[PDB]
Amino acid sequence: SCSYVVSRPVYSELAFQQQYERRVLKTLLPVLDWLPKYRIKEWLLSDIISGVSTGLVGTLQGMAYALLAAVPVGYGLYSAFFPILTYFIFGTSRHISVGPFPVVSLMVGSVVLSMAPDEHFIISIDFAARDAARVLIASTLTLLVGIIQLIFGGLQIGFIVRYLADPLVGGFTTAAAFQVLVSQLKIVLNVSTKNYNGILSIIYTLIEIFQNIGNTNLADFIAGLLTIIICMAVKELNDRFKHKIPVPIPIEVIVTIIATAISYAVNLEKNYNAGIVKSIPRGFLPPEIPPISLFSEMLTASFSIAVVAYAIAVSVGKVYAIKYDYTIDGNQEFIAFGISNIFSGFFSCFVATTALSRTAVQESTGGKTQIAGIISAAVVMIAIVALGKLLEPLQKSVLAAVVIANLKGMFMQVCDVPRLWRQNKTDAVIWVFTCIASIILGLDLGLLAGLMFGFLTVVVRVQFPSWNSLGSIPNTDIYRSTKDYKNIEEPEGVKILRFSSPIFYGNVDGLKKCIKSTVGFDAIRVYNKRLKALPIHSLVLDCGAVSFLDVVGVRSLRMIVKEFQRIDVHVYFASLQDHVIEKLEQCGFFNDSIRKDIFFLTVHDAILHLRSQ
Amino acid sequence: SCSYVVSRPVYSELAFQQQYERRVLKTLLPVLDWLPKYRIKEWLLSDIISGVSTGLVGTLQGMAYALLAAVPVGYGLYSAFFPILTYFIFGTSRHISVGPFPVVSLMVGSVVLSMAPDEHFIISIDFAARDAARVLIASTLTLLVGIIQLIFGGLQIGFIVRYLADPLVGGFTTAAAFQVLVSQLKIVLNVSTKNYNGILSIIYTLIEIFQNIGNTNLADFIAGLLTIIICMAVKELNDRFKHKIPVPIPIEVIVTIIATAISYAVNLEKNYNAGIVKSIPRGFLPPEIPPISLFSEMLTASFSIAVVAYAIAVSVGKVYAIKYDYTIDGNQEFIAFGISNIFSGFFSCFVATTALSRTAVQESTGGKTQIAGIISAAVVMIAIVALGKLLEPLQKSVLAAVVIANLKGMFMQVCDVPRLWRQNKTDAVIWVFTCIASIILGLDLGLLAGLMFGFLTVVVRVQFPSWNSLGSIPNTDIYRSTKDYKNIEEPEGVKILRFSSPIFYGNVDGLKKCIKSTVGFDAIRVYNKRLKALPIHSLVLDCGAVSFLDVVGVRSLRMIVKEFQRIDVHVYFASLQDHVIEKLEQCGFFNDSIRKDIFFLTVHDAILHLRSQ
């Protein structure tokens, strides 16, 4: 077959260089970008049906996720209404449904509970004033999140979601599922548990819940358990029996309607002392400027909430964009969601993002442009102004059970954890660390710790690389580790070391140790012994994988070269990239008799050059 | 001259694998490790003189650095005495002098001031009780630092000091010099400034100092200014006139003795209301168990103090070990200094490490084994029990001026900052970020921020690598970027991309973008266009610099290969390391018709194989 034949001079870097010479309508994305390009002829019907369906779903979803936040039921309607309208303008994706997404809602509610506890606020009981303070805190947090997202989009840093690795995303998702399960379990049991804010909070809440389980409201518990059973049964049947009925069954909406029907008919609120929403505001409240003085106590939480919400939004947007063959602007997504959160925070809402289930409902029933979003917002509006009284008898345990039923996919990742461990240990370590940190910490603090641990794992993987002592395959130019192939011959008096990493400070000490181990000695000690009195003659450093190089790395390389030259041992560098050589020359490496003549193109020119002497 | 001639088959990874088959008396370092091997015949005199000199220096240094900590003068004597005795046993280095090192002392004092403010403690004035509380807090912090150091040495993690990069070390050193200058400027002026704890504290202290400069004690200011002038003048003369008098002149000790002499003779304390130490305990106080309940409020500070103190200790130890041709055990250094800090915290001392100036004094005057340390400790002991009364009239402004005079070398690094910028921008960025963070934050918080900023810079450098579209140098096997050499020919219908970095999540998005830019299109869009209807035929990925690879990287590579195969474009990998191929095979890459036959040894076997078809 084909043969590898090449005849050329032995090029050093100096010789190679001698012979071959070197050397305005986007930030505010218009609705006019697609409204003139609309398809009113046929798209109107699909948009209307899709919007009605996703609005029916999203009213219930926002109502339920308002419990995840520490705000009274009714402000979830505002959170499902306002951001959709103000994302219809600046939004790039045309399939996602803007809403609470209970993970972000639970982060917001954790912040609100921390900044407005039951005992710290009410000393009389002042439900109304406490709810007002909680709403103000949620609005302030939403405004801060929107400001942060707008700043990030303006700075065009949309790649920060790359740092949200799949393992840490999965671990954070499982931990958030556990936290949401604990919160909604507190809600369904109708048990009055004091809120624990800080570290180990979830386990303290579980301890108090299992201590107060004797005070469980039987009616609420049965309602929640039946809602969960019905929802998961219908979801499993849809997953199995999927060839027919392509549109997923909106079981949650029907379950809520029926449960509200019985709650009104038999009046569980008075007869069985059930925990119902009991209050829904009618009409739209006037906008109120949040107190910016609280921004200092929300920074570490607003940052994490913004990052998580934007990551979820872009994830769903990309999932549907690759399906419908279009591209979403990440920085414009940041702009759209930052403006959305600012607008919603001004109008008394908590942080808004997209939800995979709501987006799936919107798309599967005739998914088209964001006009479906406007229709869903209109449905939420008529729910706010008209259907508010009808939803009063509905129990909160039903909403909490709906969220718990939806938690299955989030809980499912512990099954793929062991496969992650079998494939790559560090990825499973990142997963488990993110899960544990987000459990025994805040979800915001857990996310920050998971990101930080991902950075640390990258640094450690770069800092402790694979290094080999290379030898030549006979009659070829192929050099492999001598201990791996058993047909590898060690060259005469010359050791070849491959350090498969960029050289920085941690790598500097690692590389010094690796060279000392490979050559079998250290230049300092032998030089000192020879001075007091008064096996290897060449060391080739295979630097093909040396990506970057810092001042500490250049200083270490110079020190190694000088130390080995002091004992009449020549150090040669091979396979160094052009940019690394530029870094060496601009870091002052080529001073004091270096002259770039000890640099070769591959580790075969070095060996041939040594054989020439 | 020598020529590059090689004849061999074109080996893919599959073909290459087919043809070439693969496959108890240290933790407590005894004084008996060198005491039987001692040289009593001649080493005793050198050790005695060196110990006397360094003890005279270290008594004054500990006395001065006790002001850097928020503890009364006199406990610096204990901090200079006890750790030396308990490091004589477990210590590896035989040249360093154990003591306060005013940077660690200032970190301890910042912690102590934060945890025992003037207004929060005294509400009557209760100098005695406040001093007792400050001493207890310093002892608790020292015990926690010792526990952390002992744990780190037991875990054998002595490489954490590699993460203390030279740029961040220099920036932290300059910021610590600024903080120490501010503190000792507050002391010398004898101005009562309320202590600011937290962020922006140094600038608040400067503002208050310049506001209260009208209340400056003239006698203390003149004493401090004269002490500074004399110390720097003598140091400059020694640096210039250095051929004679090899032993550095101990100007600080003589200056302190003379200043105390005039303070006793003229009684500056009563006549001019000078700020004197005014109190030195006689004898040794009984040991007291620190309250461990304060450990929770010292963790972020104790960790940083332990890391900084250990880093300084090992830095000085290595500097003198490479000079005297011996090796110091890093983990045993951790053990020794952790036991030292535990012992000193039990005996009412603040955190102990080594000082470059004190170690230089000890070594230059007959530096020998740690017996000189024992002699210095004995000198400090006789200062504690006898010379305590003689040092009472000495002003604190003299000690603060001594520290300020020593701050010159620490302040000098702003001179090398611009050269760091010219050599490597990211290293200067690390330097400046560490300096600014340690200025507007705590020194401990500044150190943590600088460390993780170094981690972030490493992650970013790996995440945004140098990538090139390679082409062949004629009649050779040398492939270089087509836009850099101008003699490079693009091969027929095949693009070669070199991604000079390990492939992880941020890198997988970067690599997808790089491939899309290089090939001039994207597989997804062209495949979708062809499906709706119903330039490059090969892409070689030069993966020589791909160091590691995670599950996200393997998934991205599989997706790229599948997407390009969908549009009849073949993707080949070349120069991949053996361990990266093992990672690919254990991550499930070689499934669904991959078969490892698209992997070549270098980027010339791929081109020859393509030319074969």
Ligand SMILES: CCCCCCCCCCC(CCCCCCCCCC)(CO[C@@H]1O[C@H](CO)[C@@H](O[C@H]2O[C@H](CO)[C@@H](O)[C@H](O)[C@H]2O)[C@H](O)[C@H]1O)CO[C@@H]1O[C@H](CO)[C@@H](O[C@H]2O[C@H](CO)[C@@H](O)[C@H](O)[C@H]2O)[C@H](O)[C@H]1O
């Ligand atoms: C883009 C990159 C990432 C950016 C991340 C930004 C993080 C910003 C943190 C901000 C911060 C540190 C600043 C320095 C940080 C140094 C870090 C060094 C790291 C080195 C590796 C500000 O610190 C000070 O905090 C004071 C309050 O303590 C605050 O208020 C004071 O002045 C007010 C008038 O101004 C006055 O009204 C007020 O009365 C005063 O008290 C001050 O204004 C503020 O300066 C800490 O505050 C954050 O908020 C909370 C505070 O309690 C705290 O909440 C947690 O509570 C749960 C437990 O209960 C916990 O479980 C939750 O998680 C979380 O809800 C957060 O944890 C904390 O973080």
Ligand SMILES: CCCCCCCCCCC(CCCCCCCCCC)(CO[C@@H]1O[C@H](CO)[C@@H](O[C@H]2O[C@H](CO)[C@@H](O)[C@H](O)[C@H]2O)[C@H](O)[C@H]1O)CO[C@@H]1O[C@H](CO)[C@@H](O[C@H]2O[C@H](CO)[C@@H](O)[C@H](O)[C@H]2O)[C@H](O)[C@H]1O
């Ligand atoms: C190896 C790698 C590094 C390890 C670093 C380890 C750091 C550990 C920090 C410990 C920590 C957070 C724990 C969670 C951190 C999560 C981080 C996630 C990061 C994700 C990327 C504990 O948090 C809680 O703090 C409570 C006090 O607030 C403390 O006391 C409570 O219960 C007691 C009875 O138990 C009871 O007696 C007490 O009355 C209660 O109040 C609790 O016990 C304790 O759990 C925060 O505490 C640390 O100490 C100080 C507190 O004020 C604070 O001091 C700063 O003040 C200056 C301004 O004034 C500032 O300028 C200085 O710098 C610094 O002196 C520190 O800043 C803070 O850090």
Ligand SMILES: CC(C)CCC[C@@H](C)[C@H]1CC[C@H]2[C@@H]3CC=C4C[C@@H](O)CC[C@]4(C)[C@H]3CC[C@]12C
């Ligand atoms: C579609 C589903 C979710 C509708 C749920 C309707 C709720 C309100 C219904 C369904 C089952 C009902 C329970 C069935 C049995 C009992 C026991 C009886 O001694 C008291 C009433 C009580 C406790 C009922 C309360 C109301 C209840 C919980």
Ligand SMILES: CC(C)CCC[C@@H](C)[C@H]1CC[C@H]2[C@@H]3CC=C4C[C@@H](O)CC[C@]4(C)[C@H]3CC[C@]12C
């Ligand atoms: C009992 C209630 C009140 C609290 C616990 C939450 C309940 C409703 C939910 C939360 C997550 C759920 C689990 C999620 C995943 C699976 C795997 C599946 O193959 C069998 C069902 C099973 C095992 C579910 C059982 C029911 C479950 C445990």
Ligand SMILES: CC(C)CCC[C@@H](C)[C@H]1CC[C@H]2[C@@H]3CC=C4C[C@@H](O)CC[C@]4(C)[C@H]3CC[C@]12C
């Ligand atoms: C509310 C509290 C109780 C939640 C606690 C969740 C913790 C304990 C759970 C959540 C996910 C779990 C992990 C999921 C999968 C695996 C792989 C298998 O080899 C068992 C261990 C391990 C690694 C589990 C360890 C325990 C774990 C980290």
Ligand SMILES: CC(C)CCC[C@@H](C)[C@H]1CC[C@H]2[C@@H]3CC=C4C[C@@H](O)CC[C@]4(C)[C@H]3CC[C@]12C
């Ligand atoms: C070790 C390999 C063979 C396990 C293969 C099956 C995996 C996917 C299953 C089998 C049993 C499962 C565990 C069973 C029980 C628990 C406790 C709870 O905290 C959830 C996670 C955890 C820890 C599960 C994690 C996933 C698990 C380990």
Ligand SMILES: CC(C)CCC[C@@H](C)[C@H]1CC[C@H]2[C@@H]3CC=C4C[C@@H](O)CC[C@]4(C)[C@H]3CC[C@]12C
């Ligand atoms: C096809 C293979 C992977 C199936 C393996 C069984 C799976 C479905 C089962 C085995 C054990 C189960 C876990 C057991 C315990 C808990 C704790 C609960 O609070 C949430 C559900 C969770 C986390 C379960 C999730 C589903 C689970 C992981």
Ligand SMILES: CC(C)CCC[C@@H](C)[C@H]1CC[C@H]2[C@@H]3CC=C4C[C@@H](O)CC[C@]4(C)[C@H]3CC[C@]12C
């Ligand atoms: C990868 C890196 C950045 C992760 C860093 C996580 C560190 C800072 C976190 C993770 C878990 C945290 C601990 C969790 C619980 C407690 C108990 C509390 O009474 C004192 C604080 C203490 C002891 C915390 C100290 C800080 C801590 C150790």
Ligand SMILES: CC(C)CCC[C@@H](C)[C@H]1CC[C@H]2[C@@H]3CC=C4C[C@@H](O)CC[C@]4(C)[C@H]3CC[C@]12C
């Ligand atoms: C070797 C050096 C450091 C010795 C320092 C000795 C100190 C105590 C001496 C040296 C110079 C002296 C000052 C010289 C001049 C004056 C002005 C006079 O109107 C009041 C006394 C006062 C303010 C003296 C106070 C004491 C003083 C500050």
Ligand SMILES: CC(C)CCC[C@@H](C)[C@H]1CC[C@H]2[C@@H]3CC=C4C[C@@H](O)CC[C@]4(C)[C@H]3CC[C@]12C
């Ligand atoms: C005036 C006093 C009270 C407060 C300021 C500190 C004084 C004593 C010290 C601290 C650092 C010192 C500087 C450090 C470095 C240099 C560079 C040298 O080539 C000339 C002297 C000079 C410029 C020093 C002058 C004196 C100095 C500014």
Ligand SMILES: CC(C)CCC[C@@H](C)[C@H]1CC[C@H]2[C@@H]3CC=C4C[C@@H](O)CC[C@]4(C)[C@H]3CC[C@]12C
């Ligand atoms: C107590 C307060 C005032 C201390 C403030 C210290 C800050 C402002 C100082 C300390 C060291 C300084 C840096 C040292 C060297 C250089 C290089 C030159 O190109 C000037 C800018 C730059 C980058 C300086 C910027 C300002 C700087 C960061």
Ligand SMILES: CC(C)CCC[C@@H](C)[C@H]1CC[C@H]2[C@@H]3CC=C4C[C@@H](O)CC[C@]4(C)[C@H]3CC[C@]12C
């Ligand atoms: C820019 C190049 C040419 C400068 C070369 C000389 C360098 C070493 C010197 C010249 C002037 C110096 C600056 C002069 C003044 C200040 C203000 C103060 O905060 C100290 C740092 C800083 C910012 C100095 C940093 C170092 C500096 C920039």
Ligand SMILES: CC(C)CCC[C@@H](C)[C@H]1CC[C@H]2[C@@H]3CC=C4C[C@@H](O)CC[C@]4(C)[C@H]3CC[C@]12C
């Ligand atoms: C040989 C070359 C590098 C000499 C350049 C001049 C050097 C010695 C001078 C120029 C400007 C000076 C700085 C000017 C201002 C300050 C602020 C002060 O609070 C500490 C000293 C410090 C930081 C000085 C240190 C010395 C300095 C950097």
Ligand SMILES: CC(C)CCC[C@@H](C)[C@H]1CC[C@H]2[C@@H]3CC=C4C[C@@H](O)CC[C@]4(C)[C@H]3CC[C@]12C
């Ligand atoms: C590389 C990474 C780890 C560095 C992280 C540094 C971050 C967390 C630090 C650096 C400087 C800090 C800020 C410094 C000053 C203030 C003003 C205060 O009123 C509120 C907190 C706030 C706004 C801090 C927030 C946190 C902050 C932005």
